[PDB]
Amino acid sequence: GKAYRQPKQKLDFYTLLDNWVLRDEAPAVEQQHYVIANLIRGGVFGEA
Amino acid sequence: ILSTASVLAFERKLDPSDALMSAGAWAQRDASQEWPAVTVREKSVRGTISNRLKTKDRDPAKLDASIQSPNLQTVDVANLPSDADTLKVRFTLRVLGGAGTPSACNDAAYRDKLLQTVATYVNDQGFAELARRYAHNLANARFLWRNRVGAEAVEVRINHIRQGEVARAWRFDALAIGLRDFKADAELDALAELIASGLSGSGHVLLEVVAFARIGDGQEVFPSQELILDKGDKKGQKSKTLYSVRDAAAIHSQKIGNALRTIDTWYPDEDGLGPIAVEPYGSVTSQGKAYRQPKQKLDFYTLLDNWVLRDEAPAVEQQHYVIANLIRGGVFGEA
Amino acid sequence: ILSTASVLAFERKLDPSDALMSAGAWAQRDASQEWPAVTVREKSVRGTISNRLKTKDRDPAKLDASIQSPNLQTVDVANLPSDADTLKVRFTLRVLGGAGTPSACNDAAYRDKLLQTVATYVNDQGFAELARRYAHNLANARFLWRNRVGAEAVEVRINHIRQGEVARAWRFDALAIGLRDFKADAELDALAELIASGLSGSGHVLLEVVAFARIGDGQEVFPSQELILDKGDKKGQKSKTLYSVRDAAAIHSQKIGNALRTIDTWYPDEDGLGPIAVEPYGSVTSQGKAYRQPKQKLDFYTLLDNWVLRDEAPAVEQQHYVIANLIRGGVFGEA
Amino acid sequence: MNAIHIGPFSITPAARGLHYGGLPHHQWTLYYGPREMAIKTLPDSYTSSEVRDEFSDIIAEFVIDARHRYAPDVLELVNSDGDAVLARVAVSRLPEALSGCIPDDRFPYWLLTASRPRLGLPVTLNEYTALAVELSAPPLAWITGLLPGEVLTHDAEEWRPPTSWELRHVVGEGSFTGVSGAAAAALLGMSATNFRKYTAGDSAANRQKISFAAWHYLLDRLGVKRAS
């Protein structure tokens, strides 16, 4: 019932993706593995 | 001065039916006339918080509290049987003819000028390029929208039903014929001539199109999705509703028509996307943008106004686009 | 001076019923009495804007935002079954006598003069040409309005029902008898004589009109449409409703009456545009044009006034048009 | 009696009357050009004011529906978080640089649409001021949705002069702007008789068609178009 990778510690999928794509700040290879796994699982990413 | 007509309604050619989904096994698709239909059923899904939060829901306590109350809902789901790996989708297509004639026209002079313009087009180059591209979208299973993305082998069978009987049969490999290139092939040419005779009005043509997709045992298939009134309880929300006619998963006829309509390769932007549906203002729903912007003077209405009112005939590619849009039909003219 | 009466309510001759429309297979259409009815169901449609922009919506961002927020509708749609390729449409027709007699009038002298005028018309030339043209709009399935455009084969069966049993049966190839020419035919002559006897008041005529058409296997059929109150949301908007009587798709009886009424080939414009339904002021809503304008001396009211009040009898074609307007009925007269 | 004209609306009575109860009555039908809106059977002892008051509610709900249907789309200026709205501007058209956007922290101010799929771009206060100045909507911009696009175009070769009925949308006391014809003539520096000649009915021999500059300056001064 808890969330590892809180957005406060900047290790969630959305902050990592935004930093990697927009700011060109590539994270650690583990974190980009996690991001690409999130792209593999699919989703409805992107709010208004 | 020959201004345009306020009422310019058109009826559509290339009328498809609802495409019914049935299931079975590969190498028995020659006896697929009695295959059981794919049935839309209910299953339960449990989801977590996976959407973006607006900087106020990102609190760890609030996020965890949202985790402790997950969204429970039921979804309409269509799956193949666990002993069947092939999906069969069958619809019938009717090609009418008489594309340049509007169904409603305020001005008689504009009606006559538009008829002369379309007749000049057909006399110069008939419905041969457009019918070839429509036959290409028939040969590849583009009407098999998401059921084609991971299918290992796709085969499309198209029959010409003259007096309730197969007057001519076509068998195609829908993966060899890609979704990017409009090449030339003898069977594609024959189907193109048949669709051309339908569009010209030479004779009545009715096409029965059957597509087989080898997807896998028990794999999910994707019929068209309906609208939910969103009034019931949150637990029994019915967040996803699938389209069926009589306990058989089906695809909307306008989705099939949109997939056959994907012949427009002449829009000003690059060929990275490939063909798009022939719509006014070149709208693509997935990309959320409009190729053929009216600002770029390449949409349907500006081209038609230049071609008909003031005799400025565009390039033959834009002429194909305009005639394909007239085949598509719509409520043109100022409301 | 014999001024026109202030009410000229006329009752409608050639009274049809709502045409119920059902489905089945060709060559079993002789035993079509137990064919299942065509049901009106709902499907969800999504589309982008394809109409002309107001020059205010031509801004690219507004168009892109409209594409990214497409309009959602649910529509009533009527289709044939995926195992049936023939649509059967059945209605009953009554031919009544006493066309020139009004149902309401204010002036005994005017109604006597009008009755004398209609009587001397019938004596000079009875309901022979008018009933000939009516037989045609029944022998060609013009009441199959959009169900005839791309149909491969259409035939109609007219049965004369006397004491509840078929007195004489007619069978016509509705595609052979066109929608434009009033040619001469022996069975058509017999049906015309029966309709003439019904119009003359010399006998009771009740016709059972059954039409079969090869629309196609599972293809869309087109019943009559209702008004939309637009009292709901904009997503489940219910933008289209179809007509059904007791769960069977149906066509309005006034649409059938208009279809049989299309006999006017005497309007001052060229008759190569086709026959028109007889109306005061020769109105066509699809074309937005009034043939037989009151500015010309060829509309119904000026013809009726000149013929009756001051004995200026028009040409026999124009008086055929006048008597056709008297047969169709209407609330004529000033106020 | 006689037809009552309220701006673009018309309440015409039936030619023949009837008796409901023991009192004479006529049916009064309301029009919006060619569109019939409502019919009411009213006593013959009513004056024109009472007949107008009978249809005032239907006219008011037409006005409300027209204001809500053709309301100009709204742009919102938000911070980096994208949650707090700092300023709202209603625009006649959107900027051409609007694309699908979620605000970042790379830029402090973002201009976004009020539509649920939000379009936007990073904007400075100077650029936002310039865009709001050259894109703002006049307070009566909803009336332009009731007019055709060939009378509201700035292209002189595609422009058609408005008819009397299209003029009465904005010129009369029963119109949507509420100004008089004399006030409209004063706004254009024109004689009141010459401007009445513009909104003259079809049963008249002296009718004049308004020019391009006069019509568009009238729309500017009335707060309907090109007033920001």
Added chain:
Amino acid sequence: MNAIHIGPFSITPAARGLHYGGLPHHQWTLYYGPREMAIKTLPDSYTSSEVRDEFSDIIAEFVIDARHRYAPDVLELVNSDGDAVLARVAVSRLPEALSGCIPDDRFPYWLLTASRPRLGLPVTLNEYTALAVELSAPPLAWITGLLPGEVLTHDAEEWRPPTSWELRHVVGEGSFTGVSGAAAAALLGMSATNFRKYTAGDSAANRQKISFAAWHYLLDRLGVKRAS
């Protein structure tokens, strides 16, 4: 030779001549209406397009001075300190509620003038954008300083139609806006032949006057006035 007319400027030659050196010579006199700016003695071998280039620098200096001395007042949007200018807008007229002000901390945004005795008004971003939309200045608003105040007024009773020379300030090849007569006629939705009658001078046969609505709409479209 011939009197060269460049918008409101007119280079007229001397009727008599002179021989400076041995070559023929004439005195060319630049005019700004009834105002004389320069006399320059030039040969007769120069073409009109070369005398125009000879007198071009004085005209450019006049235009620079006119643009500088008639620049619209600039407003400044500042924070709760008054040091950082977040946004600036040029206005045709100041806000009605300006008083002498020094920004403090109780309000986050302040709208101060650019003049050193800074008048001000506490505003939010929405009210600041409303004021900027209402009060903005068009890009060519400096030409209104070269025009009389009775031809720019919005009151129809106190309005006087501009003359031909006052019209040459805003339309013409050598005007301060640089738009041709055909382009101005296309902006007003009228024929170029009728606008040439507006711009006609000294030809008493068929010379016309511009109207209130046409003049103010032209000033709107050229970017001179009413473009807030």
Added chain:
DNA sequence: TTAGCTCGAATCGAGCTAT
């Protein structure tokens, strides 16, 4: 404020010109 109407005078469009 609505809804018009003459009557002479000025304006408007679309033809031509000239430079």
Added chain:
DNA sequence: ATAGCTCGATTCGAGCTAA
């Protein structure tokens, strides 16, 4: 693009009525 013309049709202002 400047500069100007003619000619018949349309607009325009200031009287007036009509309500």
